[model samples]
Target: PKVGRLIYTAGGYFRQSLSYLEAYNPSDGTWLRLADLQVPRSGLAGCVVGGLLYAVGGRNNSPDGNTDSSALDCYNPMTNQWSPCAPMSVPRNRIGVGVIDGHIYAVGGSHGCIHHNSVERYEPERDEWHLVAPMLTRRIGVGVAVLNRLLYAVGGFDGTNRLNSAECYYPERNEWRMITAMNTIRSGAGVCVLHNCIYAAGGYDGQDQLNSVERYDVETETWTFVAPMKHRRSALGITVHQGRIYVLGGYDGHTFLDSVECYDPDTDTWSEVTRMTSGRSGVGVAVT
Candidate 1:
């Protein structure tokens, strides 16, 4: 099969839960509308495995109120279609997702007012999900990434507080180990690994929305502040393409954002990019 890179952004919230799916091509700076999710979701997590983009658990909008979802949707670029996969064991909103050894890990999220430390892993070949070691602390709006084969979970909102703590999981050992915390507390921040460093971008820190950015050095086991973004964004969609980190639509306190921005690690600076067709927050992003 031939390969090309495309960034996918799925289910998110603007005024209500959305199933809108769209792709961005870095080469041409153009946006392409793709198939929508069968269930409208917000605060979902996404990752790519075996050329299929998986949209994980999130909350569904209803007239009564929002309901947590356990549904999983897989998008096939070739067919331009989405199909249901084995749902997670529990409903999770504002969850974190990462792929390790071709297995997808679903990390901490929340159901109603209850935050969770529970974690799960999906075996694509078997089309099933199994419970795995839970995180050290309950979390929602967490950010996760994989580096050096270890899955990392960063700052998120625990049941009682916004967190600055971080941890990593060893797949072989089926264990999670605490790691150095970020410089600031962040929940709903965009997190991704670039240049062997984990970058955590804009998110809300309980009191206010944030524009600050930070990076974690694996070798040094330290986090340091980096150039902040032009806009304060929480619940943003982040992905890496062509060696650049791009942060898409999010909420900046009162306004839902459609603005897009890119960061250059080599230069430690941020610049505006093409905006999305509409404002979106709690969006999920992945590269395929």
Candidate 2:
């Protein structure tokens, strides 16, 4: 592990689902090319668990391609390489992923345009996947995170509707409960948590691109509006580092974006940051 903040971004789109991969070096604000994914795809689910990075299911191509990915790839930063992991039981893309107590949970996503409420958990030690309590709502392109020892699934599309609903999961109980929803309906929003509050930023609302941002306070069980971003983005990659939330490239309903932004909770403000070297949508991001 080098002494620097490295952000890994995997597959996304250029003109279509691509296997393009890169890493952002905060030290010099440079994007470095990395090993491409074995499967060329977009709308992939990615997250870090136990200091190891995982790239999960995603679609192999455009809607016309007729294939949903069940791939599970793991990356070790120290070696800068990717290896195989147990494939998910469900083949889906644009899924929501989170880790709790060393177990990785894969939540709602779609097979083509059909949304799903199915959920599964992966136990690394056993290298196996098991069905878990499904989400109360079927969705795709949703945001998910683990905070304060509970998993939260945020707004996303539910086949026919863009949703504003959110849910919380308790691993021990294998249960999910509907929680306070966001102010605006969103799909493909970027999500992360800092200082115990979960933040959701930028996505589509079925009809338009959005730059609206909101945060959920667990103690209060509510969502509050925060400063909006300068750019509207959907399917963007986001992660929290050094107390700031970094939102990466995505489509804004019209064009693919390479731009990036940072949100400061202290000031409730957003500021433009160095952009990626290439335009991308459905990109994956991990920070360390």
Candidate 3:
């Protein structure tokens, strides 16, 4: 997380998904073009573990099993390379992924925009995946994160309405437990952890786009409203770097947004950092 370099991966562009990757150096406001992904797709899940970047399942142009690849690719910044790895047992897009206890977990996504409760875990040491206890509620476009060593599935649509419901998964017991629901119903909200708390920010709140944000406290198991983002976004990429929450690319209701912004939890304010090299939605971001 040095210098807060956030990398945006391949995502849906103007007419189709791309394979290009770009890294934004917050220190100088310059973006470095990185190696293209082996597979081009959108709505993919990504996580950083053991200092390696991993890109997981997502939809292709046509959006099917043929197009919705289960491919897993790894990027090594040290050597500047992209290599193939074990694929997800099931192909999915709009999925939520997080790293907990040194293992990467993929939770809930549909075959094609259809929500599923199915979850899986990948052992970085073994390069293998194993099934885990599915979530209690099915979700698509949800955000997942690790808080206090437990995996939390955040807001997303359930094919009916935007969900404020959230749940936490315990790795030791493989048990899923309900946690505090968010104050607003949101789908595609960006979830990140900072200062020992979880934050859910900027998404569609059941109706139109929402610029509002919320912060969750594990001690109270409650979510309280926080500063809203400058842009109303859904399917955005979010990560914590340099003590700031960086919210990157996504759809702003009218069009795809290349805009980038950062939230200073210390000051409770937002700033328009800079736009990305390309406009996008469903982008995957990781801090290196």
Best by TM-score: 1
Question: Which lDDT values do the candidates have, in the order given?
Answer: 0.91, 0.86, 0.83
lDDT of 3 at 281: 83
Stretches of candidate 1 above 4 Å error?
1-3
lDDT of 2 by residue, 125-215 (tens): 7878998998999989989998988999999888888899999899889899999999999999998888889999988998888999999
For model 1, name the residue pairs that clash: none
Q: Which of the two candidates, 1 or 3, achieves a greater TM-score against the reference? A: 1
What is candidate 1's CA lDDT for residue 126?
Answer: 91
1-288: candidate 3 lDDT, tens digit per residue = 444555655555445777877888888888888888876778887789878898877777643433766777889888879889898888878888999877989888778566778899999889999999999898888889898899999988777777999999999999999898999888888998999989999888867877899999998879999889888988888888878999888887798888888999889999998998878888778887
Q: Determine which window of 10 residues in candidate 1 has minimal summed lDDT.
A: 1-10
TM-score of 2: 0.96
> How far off is residue 92 in model 3, in Å?
1.4
Q: What's each prediction's TM-score?
A: 0.97, 0.96, 0.94
Off by over 4 Å in 3: 1-8, 62-66
Q: Which candidate order results from sorting by lDDT in descending order?
A: 1, 2, 3
Q: Which has the better lDDT: candidate 2, or candidate 3?
A: 2
